Amino acid sequence: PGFELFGPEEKQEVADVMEHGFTFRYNFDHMRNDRWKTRDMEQLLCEKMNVKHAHLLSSGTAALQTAMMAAGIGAGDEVIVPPFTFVASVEAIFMAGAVPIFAEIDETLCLSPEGIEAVITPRTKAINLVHMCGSMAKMDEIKAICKKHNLVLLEDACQAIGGSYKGQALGTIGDVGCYSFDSVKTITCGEGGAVITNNTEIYDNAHMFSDHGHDHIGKDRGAESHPIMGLNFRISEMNAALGLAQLRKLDTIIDIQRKNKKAIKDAMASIPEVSFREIPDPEGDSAGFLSFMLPTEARTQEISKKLAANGVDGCFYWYVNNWHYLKNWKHIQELKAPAALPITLIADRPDYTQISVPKSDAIMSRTISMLIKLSWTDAQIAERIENIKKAFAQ
Amino acid sequence: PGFELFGPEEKQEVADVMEHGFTFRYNFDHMRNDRWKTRDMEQLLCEKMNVKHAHLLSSGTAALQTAMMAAGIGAGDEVIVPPFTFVASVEAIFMAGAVPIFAEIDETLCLSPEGIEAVITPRTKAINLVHMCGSMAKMDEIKAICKKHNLVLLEDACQAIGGSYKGQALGTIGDVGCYSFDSVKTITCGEGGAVITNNTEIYDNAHMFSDHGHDHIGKDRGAESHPIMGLNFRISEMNAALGLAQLRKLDTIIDIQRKNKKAIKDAMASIPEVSFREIPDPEGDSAGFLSFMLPTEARTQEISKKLAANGVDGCFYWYVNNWHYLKNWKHIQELKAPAALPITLIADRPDYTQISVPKSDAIMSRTISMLIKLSWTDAQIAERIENIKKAFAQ
Ligand SMILES: Cc1ncc(COP(=O)(O)O)c(CN[C@H](CCC(=O)O)C(=O)O)c1O
Ligand SMILES: Cc1ncc(COP(=O)(O)O)c(CN[C@H](CCC(=O)O)C(=O)O)c1O
Ligand SMILES: [Cl-]
Ligand SMILES: [Cl-]
Ligand SMILES: [Cl-]
């Protein structure tokens, strides 16, 4: 993760806000001395990712809530979502008053075309596609499903910035995409997120909705109009500044992940039991994780235990862990919250205790994902590889 | 506003994060060198405000959202709200799927006891009391209404931190209170706010809800439980470091506000035609604004113009402006948004184009408030006073 390359660039960029800038992302022209960090981050996103618009805001979660509202995805709408993703995917749908509809993942670890096909109803408004663990889904097929059924395609790219699919940056392919710059992402703001799109009406909705409907027109904040209601997901200039310094390092970061993942994957490919996640576009993998499969569930359990025992940290058996797989989200299953949620106001909706995702279970029960870190020396990679081989040894 | 005193302490507090701390408000013990800026600002809010609990998060708006959820205020609940407040108040209610119910203000410019009483129904869960423009409501009578009717008392202290009523810090009298530390408030985090409360159950719900239900128990983040669903309103350590430095200056800010307020008011009191906002606890006034009334709307319009023409800046005729009075909120009245808001799932919603708050209109159509700045010199004040005098001269 990006935090591993914290150096003088980050310190300097943030100190500039404090020394010459201002803390608020808008206005204060007179006294911010032309320091617009948020603005600069958004433009650097547009230029690096080759998208028309980027709107930076308070978190990746706030991104998803904002992207959904901005795209016309609201109260009562069905939104297809996978059962392997971070909890925020499902929380944002529920908070919107929308209805999550689980669809199956495939061997890409992301929504399957056929899975999506099978749960499309007429209530369906959107697909919430997640590029999990730094790689991507079968995008041409999913795009075609969304075009044929008239569905909004939202990309959650919060774990895969710098990845691409056929020369298109992840997050730029659907109607709208989201990024996270939380403290453990590829690139960080400490906290922050972005909504990205080539659709200007979506962008306008996004910047307005994340700032109380403020049109952001003119130089008098107080005099601005509010064509819509909204909320507050503004990001500070210090958070943006840190993000600006980090995004300037994204290419180095992706190259290190790619190099490190390759070396480890290459040596693991001589262990016959190991299968690897499917990658539709190998050139476009951001390489944040090496995801591998064992032949059976029991064997997966055993390898997970032995990786840990042999010092191979940063391995995630998502199937049994609490934050990335539906099966261990009883809280979500049973709509637990200290006040009534909007989803409770909808009668005709899934019983969330009774979701079956058999084909996701089949894959995820045998899947372990290893985090690819930036700090690793070649000696440390060699040792990790030896520890992996010892973990598989029999 | 606190931005007026930015100096070395704010620079130093944030540079301490970037040079020796970490960006994320939790965990990372091994590498943050004991810098817990978010933790410290929370503790300091507990000390200064004699409250048991403080939770710091991404904004004042997120504080309102989080406080409602944390106190049991949710979909279908009626929440009584003033027509004079920032838009965020009504936005936060709608987004919870709760039903804002407008009640009349009195000459305190806060909800009137009798206004509140006239609009209670069995569905009322809460009174959303706003301490507008730095001062308070008739808090003993309001608290009595909430006890007799078994209603949650939520305090929006987002514009009145440092204020008090009978020795009790504003935001601590009801069941839950809310602050803001946006860039133009009294005390700033750049962007930030907090939920304060003496009720541990409310606090626990607040810190969980604002971090995807994370329990925050133990040292391993991934091993934590999620008793409830949540969202992300986490605050960066950099935002917290700024608010920490600011919050240590709060006493000075408030002194300077009272002293400056008293100068202008003393002087305006000698203009026979002026009446002042009612202040239930004069020594508990935070003094962010001097608010005064004229006998007619026409005369208020006239004075507004003449004040600006004579260089009496910082004057807000809320009635006629976009961000703080129901009458100019067509967007809210007609529920304008790019996707359906959760309020739309409540089929016997009030019609928000038909709200009648005649007493509020009668006060607000004649009210003007003047922001008390901290930078003002003795001579700028003297010039201001004399300028106000010219404007009233007829
Ligand atoms: C796919 C996806 N969507 C949304 C988010 C939300 O991002 P933010 O934290 O900026 O709101 C994450 C964050 N990924 C989490 C970090 C979880 C945590 O510890 O907070 C992860 O997958 O580990 C994510 O991976
Ligand atoms: C009573 C009240 N509640 C909530 C908020 C929202 O806080 P936050 O901005 O942290 O989400 C404000 C903000 N004070 C506004 C400033 C609005 C702006 O310029 O954005 C005001 O009343 O002017 C407020 O005064
Ligand atoms: Cl992989
Ligand atoms: Cl997990
Ligand atoms: Cl006053």
Side-chain angles (χ1 to χ4, degrees):
Chain A
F3 72 78
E4 296 179 82
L5 300 192
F6 281 168
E9 300 78 8
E10 287 88 3
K11 300 180 185 184
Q12 289 169 22
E13 204 65 37
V14 174
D16 192 43
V17 171
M18 304 315 293
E19 290 305 320
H20 302 124
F22 190 60
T23 62
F24 182 45
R25 65 157 297 163
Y26 301 118
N27 304 299
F28 292 86
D29 301 65
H30 60 303
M31 56 83 116
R32 73 196 304 135
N33 296 296
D34 221 32
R35 269 58 186 182
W36 310 90
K37 303 307 203 194
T38 298
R39 197 182 282 177
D40 290 352
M41 191 164 176
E42 289 170 351
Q43 123 138 147
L44 189 50
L45 290 168
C46 289
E47 279 158 8
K48 294 200 85 102
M49 308 303 166
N50 292 303
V51 234
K52 218 214 261 60
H53 311 282
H55 184 65
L56 205 70
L57 43 59
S58 50
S59 69
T61 306
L64 298 161
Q65 315 191 237
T66 299
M68 286 191 295
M69 173 59 69
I73 308 309
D77 288 332
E78 289 179 351
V79 177
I80 298 181
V81 59
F84 173 41
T85 176
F86 176 69
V87 283
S89 291
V90 182
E91 298 167 325
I93 299 165
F94 279 146
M95 303 312 155
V99 191
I101 297 301
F102 296 93
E104 289 284 20
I105 61 143
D106 65 27
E107 296 68 28
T108 70
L109 303 189
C110 307
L111 286 177
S112 91
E114 37 267 288
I116 292 168
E117 265 156 6
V119 295
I120 287 167
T121 80
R123 256 113 294 108
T124 303
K125 198 87 155 287
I127 293 162
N128 187 123
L129 215 225
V130 187
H131 300 296
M132 274 305 299
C133 295
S135 188
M136 81 304 296
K138 301 180 177 164
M139 304 299 300
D140 285 342
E141 24 281 273
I142 297 174
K143 272 203 275 181
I145 292 176
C146 297
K147 166 226 208 286
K148 182 170 159 287
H149 297 273
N150 223 269
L151 303 175
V152 160
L153 172 56
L154 153 352
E155 285 178 83
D156 174 337
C158 296
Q159 308 202 341
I161 189 174
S164 56
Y165 174 87
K166 290 183 192 172
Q168 297 158 108
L170 299 182
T172 71
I173 297 164
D175 296 282
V176 66
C178 302
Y179 290 149
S180 164
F181 312 111
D182 87 25
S183 292
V184 302
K185 295 304 162 238
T186 305
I187 73 286
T188 191
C189 286
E191 308 284 343
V195 174
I196 71 166
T197 178
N198 292 317
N199 185 326
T200 300
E201 195 191 324
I202 290 178
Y203 170 59
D204 280 343
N205 291 338
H207 71 79
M208 286 187 304
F209 183 74
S210 60
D211 190 24
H212 303 289
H214 270 272
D215 60 22
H216 301 110
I217 300 175
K219 273 181 155 136
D220 189 357
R221 182 162 169 81
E224 294 186 9
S225 291
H226 39 51
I228 56 172
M229 303 178 22
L231 280 182
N232 184 2
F233 301 131
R234 301 186 301 272
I235 185 174
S236 70
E237 285 274 287
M238 317 44 96
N239 286 24
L242 174 58
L244 180 65
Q246 290 248 299
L247 178 61
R248 290 175 182 146
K249 306 193 182 179
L250 179 53
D251 284 18
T252 298
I253 288 157
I254 301 311
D255 299 351
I256 291 168
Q257 294 186 168
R258 281 176 182 161
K259 174 177 70 62
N260 295 359
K261 191 184 178 170
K262 191 187 185 327
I264 294 162
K265 179 173 173 155
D266 284 6
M268 283 186 65
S270 76
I271 293 161
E273 293 187 83
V274 168
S275 290
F276 289 107
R277 176 186 185 173
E278 194 182 327
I279 303 162
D281 182 354
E283 311 173 283
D285 183 14
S286 72
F289 289 86
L290 179 53
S291 294
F292 55 98
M293 277 69 154
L294 289 91
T296 69
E297 180 191 16
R299 183 45 169 167
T300 307
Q301 279 155 16
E302 196 179 27
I303 258 50
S304 181
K305 165 193 92 209
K306 294 174 131 146
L307 294 161
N310 283 280
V312 182
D313 56 29
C315 290
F316 291 90
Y317 187 13
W318 307 115
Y319 198 60
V320 309
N321 277 149
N322 293 334
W323 295 95
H324 293 87
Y325 200 62
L326 176 55
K327 194 201 214 293
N328 319 307
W329 302 338
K330 289 147 166 216
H331 74 313
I332 287 179
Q333 276 172 31
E334 294 167 22
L335 309 168
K336 284 178 161 151
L341 296 166
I343 187 61
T344 77
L345 278 13
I346 309 182
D348 180 20
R349 94 306 213 278
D351 178 347
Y352 289 101
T353 55
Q354 298 288 285
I355 289 88
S356 78
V357 284
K359 306 178 205 296
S360 309
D361 296 342
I363 294 157
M364 300 304 301
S365 61
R366 297 181 291 105
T367 297
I368 294 174
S369 290
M370 187 184 330
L371 192 47
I372 270 43
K373 301 173 84 70
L374 308 170
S375 67
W376 295 333
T377 66
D378 288 347
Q380 297 171 324
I381 290 154
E383 190 143 57
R384 173 172 300 265
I385 281 167
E386 188 181 276
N387 292 331
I388 290 149
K389 288 194 200 320
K390 273 147 83 162
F392 280 74
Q394 240 167 11
Chain B
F3 81 77
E4 295 187 278
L5 301 191
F6 281 166
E9 306 91 344
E10 290 95 337
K11 303 175 188 207
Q12 278 154 44
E13 205 62 35
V14 170
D16 192 49
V17 172
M18 296 305 302
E19 274 150 37
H20 308 280
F22 193 56
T23 66
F24 181 49
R25 62 161 294 171
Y26 301 117
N27 303 113
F28 298 75
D29 310 45
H30 67 295
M31 81 196 273
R32 71 204 298 132
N33 305 299
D34 208 35
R35 273 34 175 215
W36 308 87
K37 267 43 174 118
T38 305
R39 165 173 304 163
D40 296 341
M41 183 175 178
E42 286 171 357
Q43 169 187 55
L44 188 60
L45 287 174
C46 291
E47 280 156 18
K48 285 200 134 50
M49 313 295 191
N50 302 300
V51 242
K52 190 178 179 195
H53 300 293
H55 187 62
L56 214 71
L57 43 60
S58 53
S59 69
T61 308
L64 297 168
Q65 294 186 264
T66 294
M68 284 185 285
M69 172 71 67
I73 298 153
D77 289 328
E78 286 178 4
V79 174
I80 296 172
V81 241
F84 175 46
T85 180
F86 189 58
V87 288
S89 300
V90 187
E91 288 165 345
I93 300 166
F94 281 157
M95 293 295 317
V99 181
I101 293 302
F102 292 100
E104 297 271 31
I105 53 149
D106 59 24
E107 296 77 4
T108 72
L109 308 176
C110 311
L111 292 169
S112 104
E114 28 284 278
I116 289 159
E117 232 129 39
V119 303
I120 292 169
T121 75
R123 306 195 197 178
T124 310
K125 183 65 65 68
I127 277 72
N128 192 119
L129 192 281
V130 193
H131 301 290
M132 279 306 283
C133 299
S135 186
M136 78 304 285
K138 289 180 191 171
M139 294 306 289
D140 275 353
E141 31 272 90
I142 289 163
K143 215 251 221 92
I145 291 155
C146 296
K147 190 164 220 309
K148 184 173 174 192
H149 280 95
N150 187 225
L151 303 178
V152 177
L153 182 53
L154 184 161
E155 282 180 87
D156 188 332
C158 285
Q159 326 197 334
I161 190 168
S164 65
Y165 173 96
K166 292 175 188 166
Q168 295 180 101
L170 289 196
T172 65
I173 296 177
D175 298 288
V176 61
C178 292
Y179 290 147
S180 172
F181 310 116
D182 86 31
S183 297
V184 310
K185 293 297 176 257
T186 304
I187 264 169
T188 195
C189 290
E191 307 279 356
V195 178
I196 67 165
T197 186
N198 289 308
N199 184 316
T200 298
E201 172 171 0
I202 287 167
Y203 168 68
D204 284 329
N205 289 342
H207 79 61
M208 292 191 342
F209 186 70
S210 58
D211 192 14
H212 317 285
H214 271 271
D215 70 21
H216 304 117
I217 276 154
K219 299 223 162 175
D220 200 322
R221 176 171 171 85
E224 293 183 6
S225 286
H226 41 57
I228 55 163
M229 289 174 25
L231 283 178
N232 185 1
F233 311 122
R234 293 197 300 274
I235 197 181
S236 76
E237 282 283 287
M238 9 329 148
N239 296 16
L242 174 61
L244 180 65
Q246 286 264 298
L247 180 59
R248 294 163 188 150
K249 299 186 173 180
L250 179 55
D251 287 328
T252 308
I253 291 154
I254 301 305
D255 281 353
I256 297 177
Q257 296 181 173
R258 286 166 180 153
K259 164 150 50 100
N260 297 3
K261 188 175 155 148
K262 187 193 186 332
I264 296 169
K265 184 190 195 170
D266 278 7
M268 288 185 70
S270 83
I271 316 173
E273 184 199 20
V274 184
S275 311
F276 296 98
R277 142 121 100 156
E278 185 180 347
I279 297 166
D281 179 348
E283 306 99 85
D285 181 20
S286 79
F289 291 89
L290 180 53
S291 294
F292 57 89
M293 296 70 168
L294 286 107
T296 62
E297 184 186 12
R299 185 64 181 142
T300 316
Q301 289 160 348
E302 194 185 26
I303 284 284
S304 192
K305 287 159 225 179
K306 293 204 160 206
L307 281 170
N310 284 259
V312 181
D313 73 352
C315 280
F316 297 93
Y317 177 28
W318 310 106
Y319 185 78
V320 119
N321 288 322
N322 295 340
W323 290 100
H324 298 93
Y325 193 67
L326 173 60
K327 183 194 208 303
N328 307 314
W329 298 343
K330 241 93 283 187
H331 70 319
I332 284 170
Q333 294 185 21
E334 295 178 348
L335 303 174
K336 299 199 123 189
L341 304 146
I343 181 75
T344 59
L345 309 165
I346 295 171
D348 64 354
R349 232 185 284 156
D351 180 344
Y352 288 98
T353 53
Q354 244 80 320
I355 298 155
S356 88
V357 281
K359 294 178 145 63
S360 293
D361 289 347
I363 293 151
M364 295 312 294
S365 56
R366 303 179 296 102
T367 297
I368 290 175
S369 318
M370 185 193 316
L371 178 55
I372 303 317
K373 300 205 150 66
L374 318 175
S375 66
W376 285 340
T377 61
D378 302 344
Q380 291 159 327
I381 285 171
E383 206 197 42
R384 188 175 287 265
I385 287 161
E386 184 259 42
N387 269 333
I388 289 167
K389 281 187 278 217
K390 287 175 67 182
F392 278 74
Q394 186 179 3

